[PDB]
Copies of this chain bind each other. A is one copy, B any other.
Amino acid sequence: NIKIFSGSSHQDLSQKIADRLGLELGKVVTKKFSNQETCVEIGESVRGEDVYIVQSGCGEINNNLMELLIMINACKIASASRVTAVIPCFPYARQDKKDKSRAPISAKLVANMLSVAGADHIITMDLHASQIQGFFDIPVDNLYAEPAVLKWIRENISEWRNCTIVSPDAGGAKRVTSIADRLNVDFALIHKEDRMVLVGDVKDRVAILVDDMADTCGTICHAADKLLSAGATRVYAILTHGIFSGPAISRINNACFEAVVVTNTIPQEDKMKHCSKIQVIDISMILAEAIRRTHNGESVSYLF
């Protein structure tokens, strides 16, 4: 009744999930034609099944999105009973408002595409902005890495009881004050005027940079400089979505991060070989549980 399928190539997360549920991943013939078109073939009947498609990480977002959309649609027209898109890192999430510009709200576009492709339900982790749930008319379960991160901080930072949770930018304020509050420690915020300004106290205390995602890590790496200058004992960076593209990985080594922690919502095994300070929090149990619970009509909020 429950069927789990994976996006192209990136199967490690999807395999971890299927394992925890006692299932094998569904058969699918996924490829790319010589001329770049996404080719998909669901290799088994999904008629009347509860289907979960777990998003791939070939690091080509548009190919990954089209592949997801094609699979949702194939399952829908093959009379699956229900189709859930499981999308740990939601594409174009950062493009969720116009911001004074004549820009697309791409995240709303993506929501509409998933909807028209035929998704009945979304499962995702740490949406860039919670309002993104408002982009759908179908139910969205938005899981949080927060509890997994708190656990890690307490269990890996000896001075965590007097540390400071720092936001790389102005927008990240709500996220850090939530974490700092849970830990009962100080928070501080960085703003790029360029010159970086710091408000709050970091002097003679462990500083933990917390952000939802880091791409090129330009901001996260400058942030670490400023924090050192301001007398931070040691600096950590915690990101739930480790995109780490471009100069990201080199800047990280070239920076003073005692460590950089991410979840495996994006595949990290390649980069970990090229970056010693990276540690991954496995989130496959959270996702498996959300699927199992979604499937059984059981409470998901429990994982929040």
Contact = CB atoms under 8 A, between A and B. Distances in A.
Interface string A33-47: 111111011111111
Interface stretch (A108-116, A231-239, A272-280): A108-116
Nearest to A117: B109
Given A33-B245, A116-B116, 15 more contacts: A36-B245, A37-B94, A45-B298, A46-B102, A47-B299, A48-B297, A62-B62, A70-B106, A76-B139, A77-B140, A79-B141, A81-B297, A99-B130, A131-B134, A173-B173
Contacts of A161: none
Interface residues of A, number: 102
A134 to B, nearest CB: 4
Identical copies of this chain, number:
6
Contacts of A188: 199
B171 A174 contact: yes
A216 B105 contact: no
Interface string A82-107: 00000000011011111111111111
Contacts of A121: 79
A69 interface: yes
